[PDB]
Ligand code: HEM
Ligand code: HEM
């Protein structure tokens with residue numbers, strides 16, 4: 001059964017992949033090779049070309065992503081050759097450096113060996129490669145609450161944070177055969193951070209807010225033609241609202257809106273003053289300004305929606321069905337000012353794609 | 362079959378309704394009466410109590426409505442007795458006056474005779490009882506674009522608008538037996554309007570913006586226990602964002618954000634300045650300020666979401682499943698600042714409820 005399931009997934013993917021690459025004539029022999037490889041071994045190995053286009057197709061099919069216009073320019077790094085935790089560590093370090101690119105962020109994915117028997121070769125515990133720790137000790141909150149459980153797990157393994165509001169979590173991952181994961185402190189030279197200032201309000205720096213440059217999702221599974229790459233971290237650049245309207249603004253995150261209202265000099269007493277809405281706008285203005293000033297890539301939600309509109313048009317021009325998740329595509333501030341808000345999207349799941357998987361802690 | 366379909370709907374509704382009213386003992390005899398009535402006449406007639414609670418349940422089941430906390434205080438006006446266009450006209454006039462209540466808006470529904478054979482007794486053409494006209498003639502846009510087709514239909518029947526940006530559409534409805542609808546101009550004394558000013562920026566009044574006080578939805582069908590009340594206008598008070606973030610801000614509506622940016626003194630040149638977002642906040646601040654200043658009921662989206670949270674809790678405290686449409690419940694500005702954004706809702710259809718129906722124009 002499993003071999004047929006794998007075979008059927010491979011047939012679908014190879015046909016689609018090679019057609020898009022203008023190599024439909026090569027399909028027959030490739031499928032013959034794969035057919036024999038599956039018979040002998042129970043699996044098959046992607047070519048570098050198949051792997052690269054597969055990761056790109058997966059981004060293209062990611063319904064929740066507003067940034068998909070640039071799907072075909074994804075930088076795909078093949079590290080299916082790694083076998084040691086040192087090689088994994090250095091590959092992760094390298095991903096951070098090359099994706100950061102001194103501020104001119106490159107959308108990048110690093111692909112580690114796939115599951116074998118449903119057996120993971122490498123198991124990454126981080127949600128993102130760069131992320132702040134979070135703590136809670138007797139009513140006292142420090143750092144990022146979303147990181148509390150991973151932070152506790154790290155400190156169970158001998159790591160200790162300084163308990164600032166912005167402790168960088170270590171890389172943490174487990175190798176096949178090991179009962180426990182290893183962890184490695186991030187070199188600060190690798191991590192670009194951006195202090196948040198406001199273009200017109202000098203007092204904004206009193207908040208001492210900052211955020212990291214590059215969002216590198218490291219806990220999702222890439223599925224390509226029946227092969228499951230459970231370890232394959234990927235990054236783009238931020239959309240401003242992610243930082244200003246969610247990470248720094250959410251009550252269950254850094255919860256900064258009341259303090260923002262204070263430094264921009266407005267009262268936070270009455271709902272009808274819309275002070276939260278005003279504070280959100282100035283905070284998001286500050287984020288965009290600060291990233292731009294430091295020379296770190298970022299996009300505002302209006303520009304991003306415009307780019308996504310072109311992605312929709314491009315899909316139609318290429319004859320491809322468009323899929324999307326309206327609830328994630330609309331930005332968390334002024335959504336109705338985007339075209340996205342005013343149309344609907346088919347939330348069907350198309351493969352190749354990126355999927356959630358169970359957390360190991 | 363229809364008598365069977367009707368019977369089954371009535372059975373379901375009467376049972377639920379009477380249980381909520383603490384009158385479960387009366388169900389048996391009531392259904393017996395309904396059974397005989399359906400056999401003789403092909404339909405049945407709601408008691409005033411059933412009708413009132415039915416309309417309230419329908420509001421309670423309205424998935425897209427953030428204002429449902431106050432479902433049980435709905436003011437239900439029974440006008441199943443009307444037979445003439447003069448009676449309909451005066452009932453509609455009366456609804457406007459009593460709902461407006463000199464600014465302290467009362468959530469109200471006026472219920473007209475139901476469909477018989479799927480044959481409408483009264484057919485209201487207005488989307489809302491109070492609404493601005495819209496025009497388009499050789500590249501020139503005037504008024505509210507959403508009203509263009511109804512406006513054109515009205516002018517087909519001998520009405521003519523002044524072609525301001527805020528012409529009040531006439532009441533327009535058709536009586537059973539008439540080929541064409543009749544129309545009646547709204548008395549201005551009945552219609553409260555609110556000039557939009559800003560609390561801190563005196564220049565805002567240069568925009569000469571205004572909006573009407575009361576949103577009175579008049580083109581939806583109320584379904585209660587298999588009975589179809591196709592004509593049953595209902596109103597609440599506005600949530601500020603409806604006016605400031607949609608009606609006045611939408612590009613396909615009054616499209617005022619560029620002009621707002623100008624009077625509040627910010628550049629509208631770069632997306633990264635978030636000038637649209639800033640203009641939206643100040644416009645919505647102005648709307649809330651202006652309604653409050655004039656003494657016309659309004660609610661901000663934060664307060665409304667807080668009230669809706671209590672509605673969720675009340676539903677759980679009772680034995681009721683909730684249901685909701687996430688895409689409509691989230692406000693169009695700062696949605697993530699509300700609890701609504703961070704949870705999900707079952708969008709199942711429960712009856713009694715309010716439903717869309719085909720426009721007789723268009
Ligand atoms: C190039 C810059 C990019 C931008 C600006 C961008 C923008 C976004 C944003 C804003 C979200 C979250 C939407 C929300 O929270 O409502 C998102 C989700 C997502 N993006 Fe992108 N993205 C980018 C690149 C990428 C890349 C390179 C990939 C993978 C190859 C990717 C795959 C995804 C996926 C899988 C999700 C949803 C994850 C989940 O369901 O939890 N994006 N994107
Ligand atoms: C008391 C004040 C009320 C407020 C503040 C309120 C708020 C709202 C808002 C803001 C919407 C639109 C949501 C959006 O555009 O995304 C809405 C939709 C709706 N409301 Fe309410 N509402 C109120 C009273 C009522 C009443 C009295 C009824 C009927 C008995 C009602 C039934 C509905 C229905 C049916 C819709 C959906 C209309 C459609 O699908 O086109 N609401 N409500």
Ligand SMILES: Cc1cc(N)nc(CCc2cc(CCCN)cc(CCc3cc(C)cc(N)n3)c2)c1
Pocket residue numbers: 215217234235236237238239242327328702703
């Ligand atoms: C409450 C809520 C609502 C919503 N619409 N979206 C979110 C998700 C924010 C989010 C969450 C996850 C993981 C969810 C499961 N643990 C991942 C992301 C990725 C955002 C992202 C990814 C990438 C690759 C680039 C970029 N600019 N942004 C963004 C949360």
Ligand SMILES: Cc1cc(N)nc(CCc2cc(CCCN)cc(CCc3cc(C)cc(N)n3)c2)c1
Pocket residue numbers: 341342576578595596597598599600603688689
């Ligand atoms: C594009 C768009 C998105 C969205 N979420 N919601 C809308 C609808 C706004 C709207 C539309 C209709 C009619 C839709 C079908 N033509 C009706 C309403 C009712 C608003 C309302 C009703 C009532 C009763 C009270 C109140 N405060 N507000 C509000 C449009």
Ligand SMILES: [Cl-]
Pocket residue numbers: 215242247
């Ligand atoms: Cl993030």
Ligand SMILES: [Cl-]
Pocket residue numbers: 576603608
């Ligand atoms: Cl409206």
